[PDB]
Every structure is written in C-alpha cells, then in structure tokens.
UniProtKB/Swiss-Prot annotation:
Protein's organism: Mus musculus (Mouse)
Higher taxonomy: Eukaryota, Metazoa, Chordata, Craniata, Vertebrata
Protein name per Swiss-Prot or TrEMBL: Heterogeneous nuclear ribonucleoprotein F
Phosphoserine modified-residue sites: 111
UniProt domain comment: The N-terminal RRM domains are responsible for recognizing the G-tract of BCL-X RNA.
Annotated signal sequence range: none
Assembly, per entry: Identified in the spliceosome C complex. Interacts with AGO1, AGO2, TBP and TXNL4/DIM1.
Cross-link (Glycyl lysine isopeptide (Lys-Gly) (interchain with G-Cter in SUMO)): 79
Positions of crosslink type Glycyl lysine isopeptide (Lys-Gly) (interchain with G-Cter in SUMO2): 94
Site description Interaction with RNA, residues in chain: 23, 27, 59, 82
Post-translational modification comment from the UniProt entry: Sumoylated.
PTM-bearing positions, type N-acetylmethionine: 8-9
Record function comment: Component of the heterogeneous nuclear ribonucleoprotein (hnRNP) complexes which provide the substrate for the processing events that pre-mRNAs undergo before becoming functional, translatable mRNAs in the cytoplasm. Plays a role in the regulation of alternative splicing events. Binds G-rich sequences in pre-mRNAs and keeps target RNA in an unfolded state.
Residue span relative to the full protein: 1 to 105 of 415
Length: 118
C-alpha cells in the first residue's frame, strides 16, 4: 500500500498538508466557532491552525481554511458538510495546504502583490 505523501522535492513540490475549507461562515465567525465546529477533527496547532479568508477590502468573505493533525481528520471534516453553525449553514471543502497558502496571501485586504521578489 502506497499512501500518504511522505515527502519529495523533485518534480511536483510535495509539501501539502491535511487541510479543509469552510464556506457559508457568518461574518462574525471566530476561530472558536471553527474549532468547536470541527470537533471530530484534530486541528493542528488549534487556534494556530485556522485561517479565515478576507476580501481585498478587509471583510469576511465567509471562506476559512483549517489545518488538521492527520488524514482521518480530513475525512471526518468532510462529514460536517452542509452543517449548521450557530444560525447559518457551513460547507466543508476538501483542500490541501499548498493552496491555503496562496488563497491567503492573495485574500487579505493587504497583499501588495505578495513579496517583493518576483
């Protein structure tokens, strides 16, 4: 059985990690709501594992990524799909880390075309 991306540099950068994207979150959604929402999941670094998505203006688009500890967590998170958080509905989306990185760098109200280098 060949599963789990141990690690590789050559070819397609293999630096992804168990992550999930939550949509439909309330404009007042806080790391806490997420942590409890994905209880069945073991978020990595807890609060230090949740990444909310913002617009170029500085608002809460609703999207919010969340890092996990292991694979199982991912499969479990996907179970919280079309869920109900507080007074709204939440939608889980299977995503990797390498992605949550770009989606963020180019999400907040302050991007400035990423870093100087280019």
């Amino acid at each position: 059985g060949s599963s789990g991306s141990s690690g590789m540099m050559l070819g397609p950068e293999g630096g992804e990690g168990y992550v999930v994207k939550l949509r439909g979150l309330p404009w007042s959604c806080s790391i806490e709501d997420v942590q409890n929402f994905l209880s069945d999941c073991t978020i990595h670094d807890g609060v230090a594992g949740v990444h909310f998505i913002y617009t170029r203006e500085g608002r809460q688009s609703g999207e919010a990524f969340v890092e996990l500890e292991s694979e199982d967590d991912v499969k479990l998170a996907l179970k919280k799909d079309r869920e109900s958080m507080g007074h709204r509905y939440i939608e889980v989306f299977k995503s990797h880390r390498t992605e949550m990185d770009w989606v963020l760098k180019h999400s907040g109200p302050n991007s400035a075309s990423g870093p100087s280098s280019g």
